[PDB]
């Protein structure tokens, strides 16, 4: 009895120690028992459909067919589904919204792993207008002086 | 402290040795990088990998293209020798039938692991539009049915 208590205690400690959380998209691709869902219709689902990547297509093949609907209708619903799933659901949303939710909301969720693709926001102006060059200069000069990094770190 | 340490490290030895997984498929050999694998210099196997359009196959080709030593072997006799001398470092990629001949009718220093990656076959070809073009296709198809094509393989 004493020998089999010590051996099993070593089994608990060893197995608990070699546990690895889902850190990147590749790990979530190889792993198959937690479900990940995007918005019903948006720039991210169409991304996956149009994407031709072994990892991405593997995910899209997964999200195409699932006994529950992995897709969520609203991003508010998507946040709730992950919280209630207790680790089962893994939403795929834009990085800025992820960093806003994990920070200015009760910390039940977190963002793990680098973003998969790239995008960008721009203070657009109508085609062929007189506020094109000065606005482009204003944005570039703001970013150089960090007035866009001081603002992001604020809100 | 010394006795507790002895028991703990012995348990570590046994546990680690128990979770040993040999390279069994092509995917496992592709992910793992400790073992170098090399095809023949010029042949249908290398041209397969060059023309291969599969990510796992391309991953091997990207590896096999550049290596500090020449992973490629000039002769299939050389390829067998390189694996034996490398003591697990070299993993030749040859056709299934030759692999099964070498691991069997040669001193068992090597073995074949994992299913074959691609497919092909050996016909008993006849000149185009010849008079005996069919009574050979029929002959092969009957031999394969009665096993005379499988008794012979199990023999040699």
């Amino acid at each position: 009895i004493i020998s089999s208590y010590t051996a099993n205690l070593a089994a608990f400690l060893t197995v608990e120690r070699m546990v690895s959380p889902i850190e990147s998209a590749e790990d979530l691709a190889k792993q198959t028992e937690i479900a990940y869902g995007t918005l019903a219709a948006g720039s991210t689902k169409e991304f996956f459909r149009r994407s031709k990547i072994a990892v991405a297509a593997k995910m899209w093949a997964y999200m195409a067919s699932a006994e529950p609907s992995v897709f969520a209708a609203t991003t508010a619903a998507g946040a709730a589904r992950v919280r209630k799933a207790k680790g089962k659901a893994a939403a795929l949303l834009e990085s800025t919204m992820n960093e806003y939710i994990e920070q200015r909301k009760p910390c039940d969720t977190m963002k793990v792993g680098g973003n998969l693709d790239s995008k960008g926001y721009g203070a657009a102006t109508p085609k062929g207008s007189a506020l094109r060059a000065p606005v482009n200069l204003a944005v570039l000069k703001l970013a150089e002086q960090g007035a866009l990094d001081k603002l992001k770190a604020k809100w | 402290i010394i006795i507790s340490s002895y028991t703990a490290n012995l348990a570590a030895f046994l546990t680690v040795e128990r979770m040993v997984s040999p390279i069994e498929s092509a995917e496992d050999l592709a992910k793992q990088t400790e073992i170098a694998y090399g095809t023949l210099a010029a042949g249908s196997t290398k041209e397969f990998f060059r023309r291969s359009k599969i990510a796992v196959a391309a991953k091997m080709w990207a590896y096999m293209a550049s290596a500090e030593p020449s992973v490629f072997a000039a002769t299939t006799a050389a390829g067998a020798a390189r694996v034996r001398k490398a003591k697990g470092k070299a993993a030749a990629l040859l056709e299934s039938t030759m692999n099964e001949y070498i691991e069997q009718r040669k001193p068992c220093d090597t073995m074949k692991v994992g299913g074959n990656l691609d497919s092909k076959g050996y016909g008993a070809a006849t000149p185009k539009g010849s008079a005996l073009r069919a009574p050979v296709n029929l002959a092969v198809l009957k031999l394969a049915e009665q096993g005379a094509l499988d008794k012979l393989k199990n023999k040699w």
């Binding site: - | 076959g121 016909g123 070809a125 006849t126 031999l143 012979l152």
Partner: protein, 104 residues
């Protein structure tokens, strides 16, 4: 009669011991000789084994479209049945007509 074109050396067809003692096709023995005996009884051909001299399986050279070896020895009418391990490939197929595989 017909002339068969098998490759020289393999696990398939080999030189038996006392090769000089024996004569004709009987000097040769192997898997693909045992096979090319069975096919005779199903197609009636009375042959005499004749190994390719070059010792290559064959491909059209890039400079000159000249097939070599067994797939060459067949196209040019030198000998008919290629009772030997020719991989069934597209390029050989467009020139020569195979059988269904006897091995995969």
């Amino acid at each position: 009669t017909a002339a068969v074109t098998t490759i020289a050396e393999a696990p398939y067809v080999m030189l038996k011991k006392n090769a000089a003692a024996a004569e004709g096709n009987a000097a040769y023995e192997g898997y693909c000789v045992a096979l090319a005996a069975e096919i005779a009884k199903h197609a009636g051909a009375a042959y005499a084994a004749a190994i390719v001299a070059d010792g290559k399986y064959g491909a059209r050279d890039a400079a000159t479209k000249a097939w070599n070896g067994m797939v060459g020895e067949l196209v040019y009418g030198r000998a008919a049945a290629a009772a030997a391990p020719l991989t069934i490939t597209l390029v050989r197929e467009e020139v020569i007509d195979f059988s269904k595989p006897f091995m995969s």
